Design a binder for these strands. Structure first.
Lengths: 27, 49, 47, 95, 695, 360, 52
RNA sequence: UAAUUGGAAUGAGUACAAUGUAAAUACCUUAACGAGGAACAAUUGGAGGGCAAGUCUGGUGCCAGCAGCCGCGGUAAUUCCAG
């Protein structure tokens, strides 16, 4: 159960990361 | 007194935080927690990610 | 005496300087210790 | 002189990068908002928001590996005191 | 260039400058001077009519002598030599100006921190012979973080120096040193001697004139919080209450002072904080005529009717629908019946029946007011009127700062024409005791310690607490070791800090962010930069700067610097999950190629099963996972790495254990204490070990 | 537990004004003279809504159900889904959120599920064209209210989605001392599970009554069919008069009845529009408590608002007697100088109000 | 720069009157705000449109 | 190039005196004082690497990338890539 949490949040905190980075670079 | 009654229970509280900084820290608050340092079968109860 | 004194740190106010030589302090020495160092090289390039 | 609107690139992982150093300052005489490097990332601790900064020209001679072209400006003084005076612990930031 | 210029209606070429050089060189210099003039826009909120006395607070080392310095300034402004000055004193220095002096104690940081939040103007005297002591430097650092007052330093002991050449060099050093602490171009006045018990008139006259044109700027904290300085202290209790209850009572206390900053609301029951006593609340608000009235102000009062001897005030020292609405005895049924002569839970208000409305609204001619040669003219006029209605907002300065400043200035006199109509009765309640109204506000539940141990020499202020500020949540602040202070700050080690109007020690915790994925606590402070921190205590607004100290007891100072931690607050909640890293170490006792059996990290075979699939790593830097609990010994487990682990190698499993914030809170209660120096709170971790002789 | 209110009147209003102030209240003797005394089900359901958006609030109900204790916490918010009970419509739950909408720690992304219209409480169209425009004037710019599924009594099954993204520090100080001039009359006629012809019939009745007035009259004809239309059939119309120059909107609404004439209801609401406008000055009678609050919780400054005495009823005074018991703010009322009407200017010094919760 | 915008018009009022006579005599041979102006252009167009 | 050493020198400053000056001050003179890094404590910009039981991002193992004032303990605590 903790595997499915530790994986899923870490995927969200990278999938939210590249969006927040690429929104900086184009602006 | 009114203020003195607050300062007594502060002085009651001030010793306990002093008598915790003296003390040995909890098994989990250390690093390199070897399985003989922590109590046997205590890892499941704590629950960490 | 009761009167509190300035610390040498807060007097000169030099914070976080990297370590330096003793030989930047007197330019006529660094000219001397360069030429005396650059005369050893001259014995090594030519004879 | 300009007003610190917000601090760009706080969320950058890689410390002392080029994305990290950027603050977005609006000029006071025009209201045009513009980005400016604040040199040596540990400096970013000194600027907060609404902090009256002097902008200068950045004006690099040759490009680096990770630089961001279009960062025209660099920040020199903040609340009247120099960042390089702050970074060397000479003066302190007035409020 | 021939046709580009002619495109504009006026000849482009005809308008030119005789000199390119002068026009261009002057243009850049003038622009730099302007840009310099521009500053971010603020609000004053101090009245044009009745301004309060700008509080000026002499500070400095005690052996120099500031009492004799304030006696040589009030004797040249009111021509009335005083004696044994104690407490705050108000003197009229001008036709509209009247400053209020306030001798700080030099020995007490508990009052030195207290005064810098309220001092409008601070006079700092540094001994010429001894330069700057620690107390001056400590006061300057605390004042800057809270909000910089206008500083006018002075330099006593100038007379002593044997050689003028050495004296001139010393003056330049102090002048240059003063520029770095304050703003360059600011010169501290020098006083040659105190032979007659007062300074020379010529030096004092320049100092008095220089202070008069100070024109102090508006501090951010002072225009958000209603504050006041207590002029005279009064207890209002029956001695029969004292004789019966036997000195145990909390005393009903009336206090007197000038309000400042923002209007303190006149409905009794706002909570308001004595600096150094605790959170109180107001009980009764009354306004009495100010003792010191400016001569211009007195002339106006005399004219309406149709005090020269006393020019100073030192009390501590010895010589309608709406009034039908706001009643509660009237029912709202009766309110409208008194005005002509229902639950809010339903949203649609009460109409009449469609039978009654359709007969009423046959004609729309009642509501037609709200819609959109002589004859011709009329028509034209009508059209014009409609054009203004159709395009008025779109149709209706050179510098943006000047404009957005008009958003404040037009907002000022639209209070003033509003307050003027009210003014005798409605304005006072709406006014809510505006700044400089010398108010008599009384208290209750002030402790017995405050009236017994009182001396007028220390000040007492009020902070009108915002409803934000009244609670107690853990705050997210960020702070650093103040770089004068030698040792670094420790996590979970008590620190007296002045946050808002309150001074208190709490137990902070110093919490970095591991590249913004969590809040990991450190154990110490990053010794040259801001670290994100957290501490229990009272709540405040974000972007509030505080300035926290170590031991504030004057019995235990030494020669170290007292101010240790400065910073602002980021946000506030009631719960921050806060993480200490712990790692579980283990050792392999049987390796293979690419698969290890690791012992003594987990105690039971069931404990392993709570942790399987965990990304184990080693010292050497190879990764892996732990897969199955080995059975026949109770503790061990098989784990597949990426490459062959050694025997000499130490596996570590990263993990996170949440911690808490210890909810200790302790207002300093400095002037409730008898001695009023040497208030001793919670000891440091190092100090307790020495007392208990532990290692 | 220090401010005490009597009676179940304006119950969702009193929780709002305690929450923004942070002053704890205790509302006792709620419906004590009933065969089923105490709270209703939805009033309990509304107290679950304030708990979901505010961390730290303590809510206590006595075991007779007539005494409710509420020490307010700070507005956190975030995103969540509230289930609305079938007694009261989803719109009724939405109105209290708008008052605390610009002040939360995060964005309000609150999903409402239930019945979406009734006789008493606000329809979705009324909130979108009435409450939202008032919020925009103060300074709540990026505020919205989306419709996913539209419901109707008695089963409903409809969904709206409150999304508020402007998180401002205070409402700006409004000055409206001019009666706004109505430019256009715009209304939306909706219907679920029933004939498209009825919606057309409703539009014909409203236009005929409003034909005499000279202004552009456009009623959007919105027809809903399928699963999106909702579990139970029904219809309604909402009409909105608006002024382009000052962005002021006036409205009136009603829904269809069990057997109603759609020619009559289209004629009725347009009469209820003009009756509302005839009593109005710069607001409506159902937009006025949203704007009275925003002058109070606006910053420490005098606002002005031109209001009319026909708006001033028994209900309006109970609004101003709930504010004085919490915020202690007298609302000064001066006559206007125009001798043709009895308008009065409502001037309020706003209490100095901030965002406790927003991060910097 | 005979004609300019002075810091204070009232101080130079006597000079401005004197300057006007010189400017009129020199420019006599030939003879022998915008936002308000925009409304004026709009109003004329609107009046012409209504008449049409 | 030196991780023990050796005595010499000098004014920056402090200062009798004389000189200076209208009188002072400084300079020019000159008694007595005044140099070993822990001073009597050179700066202001620049090029380049290295470190953690640190963090983050990507990846066809153990790598590549960004980077790192943050580690586990600890601030009277550490002597620490001597800094």
């Amino acid at each position: 159960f903790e595997a499915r949490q530790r994986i899923e949040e870490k995927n969200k905190e990278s999938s939210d990361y590249h969006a927040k980075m690429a929104h900086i670079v184009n602006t | 007194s009114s203020f003195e009654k607050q300062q007594i229970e502060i002085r009651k509280q001030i010793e306990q935080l002093e008598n915790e900084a003296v003390a040995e820290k909890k098994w989990s608050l250390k690093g390199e927690v070897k399985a003989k340092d922590r109590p046997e079968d205590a890892l499941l109860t704590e629950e960490l990610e | 005496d009761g009167k509190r004194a300035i610390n040498y740190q807060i007097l000169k106010n030099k914070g976080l300087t990297p370590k330096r030589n003793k030989d930047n302090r007197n330019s006529r020495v660094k000219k001397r210790k360069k030429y005396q160092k650059a005369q050893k090289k001259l014995k090594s390039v030519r004879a | 002189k300009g007003i610190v609107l917000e601090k760009l690139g706080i969320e950058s992982k890689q410390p002392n990068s080029a994305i990290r150093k950027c603050v977005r300052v609006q000029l006071i005489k025009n209201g045009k908002k513009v980005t400016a490097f604040v040199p040596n990332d540990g400096c970013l601790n000194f600027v907060d928001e609404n902090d009256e900064v002097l902008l200068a020209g950045f004006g690099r001679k040759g490009k680096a590996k990770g630089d961001i072209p279009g960062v025209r400006f660099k920040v020199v003084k903040v609340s009247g005191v120099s960042l390089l005076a702050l970074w060397k612990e000479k003066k302190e930031k007035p409020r | 260039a021939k046709k580009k210029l002619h495109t504009q209606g006026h000849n482009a070429k005809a308008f030119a400058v005789a000199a390119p050089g002068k026009m261009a060189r002057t243009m850049q210099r003038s622009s730099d001077v302007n840009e310099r003039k521009l500053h971010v826009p603020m609000v004053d909120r101090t009245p044009e009519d009745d301004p309060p006395p700008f509080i000026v607070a002499v500070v400095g080392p005690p052996g120099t002598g500031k009492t004799t310095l304030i006696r040589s300034l009030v004797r040249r402004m009111t021509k009335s030599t005083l004696n044994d000055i104690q407490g705050p004193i108000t003197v009229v220095s001008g036709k509209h100006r009247r400053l209020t002096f306030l001798e700080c104690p030099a020995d007490d940081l508990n009052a030195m921190i207290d005064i810098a939040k309220i001092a409008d103007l601070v006079l700092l005297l540094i001994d010429g012979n001894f330069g700057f002591e620690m107390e001056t430097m400590e006061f300057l650092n605390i004042a800057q973080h809270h909000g910089m007052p206008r500083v006018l330093g002075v330099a006593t002991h100038l007379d002593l120096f044997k050689s003028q050449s050495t004296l001139r060099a010393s003056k330049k050093r102090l002048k240059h040193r003063f520029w770095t602490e304050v703003y360059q171009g600011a010169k501290l006045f020098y006083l040659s001697g105190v032979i007659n018990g007062r300074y020379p008139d010529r030096e004092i006259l320049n100092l008095s004139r220089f202070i008069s044109v100070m024109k102090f700027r508006p501090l951010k904290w002072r225009n958000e919080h209603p504050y006041m300085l207590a002029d005279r202290f009064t207890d209002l209790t029956h001695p029969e209450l004292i004789e019966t209850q036997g000195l145990q009572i909390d005393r009903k206390v009336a206090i007197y002072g000038y309000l400042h900053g923002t209007p303190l609301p006149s409905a009794p029951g706002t909570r308001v904080h004595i600096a150094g006593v605790g959170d109180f609340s107001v009980a009764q608000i009354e306004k009495l005529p100010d003792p010191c009235p400016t001569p211009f102000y007195q002339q106006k009062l005399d004219d309406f009717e149709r005090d020269k001897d006393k020019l100073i005030y030192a009390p501590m020292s010895d010589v309608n629908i709406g009034k039908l609405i706001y009643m509660d005895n009237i029912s709202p049924e009766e309110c409208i019946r008194r005005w002509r002569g229902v639950d809010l839970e339903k949203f649609v208000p009460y109409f009449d029946t469609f039978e009654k409305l359709a007969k009423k609204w046959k004609s729309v001619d009642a509501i037609k007011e709200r819609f959109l040669r002589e004859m011709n003219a009329a028509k034209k006029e009508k059209l014009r009127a409609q054009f203004e209605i159709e395009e008025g907002e779109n149709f209706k300065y050179d510098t943006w700062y000047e404009l957005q400043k008009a958003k404040i200035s037009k907002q000022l006199e639209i209070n003033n024409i509003e307050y003027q109509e009210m003014t005798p009765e409605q304005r006072q309640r709406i006014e809510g005791f505006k700044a400089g109204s010398y108010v008599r506000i009384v208290f209750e539940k002030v402790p017995m310690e405050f009236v017994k141990n009182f001396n007028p020499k220390f000040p007492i202020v009020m902070g009108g607490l915002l409803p934000t500020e009244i609670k107690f949540g853990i705050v997210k602040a960020r702070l650093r070791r103040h770089r004068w202070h030698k040792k670094i700050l420790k996590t979970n080690d008590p620190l007296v800090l002045s946050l808002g109007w309150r001074r208190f020690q709490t137990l902070p915790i110093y919490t970095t962010t591991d590249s913004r994925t969590r809040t990991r606590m450190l154990k110490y402070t990053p010794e040259h930069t801001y670290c994100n921190a957290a501490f229990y205590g009272p709540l405040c607004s974000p972007n509030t700067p505080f300035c926290g100290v170590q031991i504030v007891a004057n019995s235990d100072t030494g020669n170290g610097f007292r101010i240790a931690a400065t910073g602002i607050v980021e946000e506030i909640d009631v719960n921050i999950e806060i993480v200490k890293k712990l790692k579980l170490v283990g050792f392999p006792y049987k390796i293979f190629k690419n698969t290890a059996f690791i012992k003594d990290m987990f105690s039971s075979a069931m404990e392993v099963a709570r942790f399987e699939g965990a990304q184990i790593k080693t010292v050497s830097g190879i990764r892996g996972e732990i897969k199955r609990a080995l059975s026949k010994p109770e503790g061990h487990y098989r784990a597949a790495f990426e490459d062959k682990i050694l025997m000499s190698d130490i596996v570590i499993l990263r993990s996170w254990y949440p911690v808490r914030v210890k909810k200790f809170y302790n207002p300093v209660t400095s002037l409730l204490l008898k001695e009023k120096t040497e208030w001793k709170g919670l000891r440091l971790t190092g100090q307790i070990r020495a007392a208990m002789n532990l290692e | 537990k220090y401010t005490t209110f009597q009676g179940s009147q304006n119950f969702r209003l009193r929780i709002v004004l305690a929450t923004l102030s942070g002053k704890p209240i205790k509302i006792e003797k709620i419906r004590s003279g009933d065969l089923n005394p105490g709270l209703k089900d939805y009033e309990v359901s509304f107290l679950r809504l304030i708990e979901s958006v505010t961390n730290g609030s303590v809510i206590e109900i006595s075991y007779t159900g007539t005494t409710v204790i509420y020490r307010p916490g700070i507005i956190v918010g975030g995103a969540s889904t509230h289930i609305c009970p079938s007694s009261k419509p989803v719109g009724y739950f939405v109105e209290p959120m708008l008052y605390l909408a610009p002040f939360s720690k995060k964005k309000f992304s609150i999903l409402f599920k239930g019945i979406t219209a009734s006789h008493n409480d606000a329809g979705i169209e009324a909130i979108k064209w009435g409450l939202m425009p008032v919020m925009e004037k103060f300074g709540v710019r990026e505020c919205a209210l989306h419709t996913l599924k539209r419901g109707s009594p008695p089963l409903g099954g409809g969904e709206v989605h409150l999304v508020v993204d402007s998180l401002i520090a205070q409402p700006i100080t409004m000055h409206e001392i001019d009666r706004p001039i109505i430019s256009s009359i715009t209304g939306v006629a909706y219907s679920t599970r029933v004939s498209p012809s009825l919606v057309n019939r409703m539009i014909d009745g409203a236009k005929k009554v409003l034909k005499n007035l000279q202004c552009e009259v456009n009623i959007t004809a919105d027809v809903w069919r399928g699963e999106n239309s909702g579990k139970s059939p029904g219809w309604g119309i909402t009409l909105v008069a608006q002024s382009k120059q000052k962005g002021w909107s006036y409205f009136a609404e009603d829904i269809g009845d069990a057997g109603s004439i759609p020619e009559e209801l289209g004629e009725k609401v347009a009469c209820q529009l003009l009756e509302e406008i005839s009593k109005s000055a710069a607001v409506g009678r159902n937009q006025l408590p949203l704007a009275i609050v925003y002058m109070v919780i606006g910053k420490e400054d005098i606002g002005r608002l031109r209001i009319n005495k026909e708006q001033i009823d028994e209900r309006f005074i109970i609004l101003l007697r709930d504010i004085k018991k919490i915020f202690n703010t007298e609302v000064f009322l001066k006559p206007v100088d125009e001798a043709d009407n009895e308008d009065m200017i409502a001037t309020i010094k706003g209490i100095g109000f901030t965002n406790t919760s927003k991060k910097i | 720069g005979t004609y300019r915008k002075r810091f204070n018009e009232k101080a130079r009022s006597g000079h401005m009157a004197k300057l006007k006579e010189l400017k009129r005599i020199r420019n006599k041979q030939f003879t022998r705000s915008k936002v308000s102006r925009l409304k004026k252009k709009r109003l004329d167009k609107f009046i012409e449109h209504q008449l049409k």
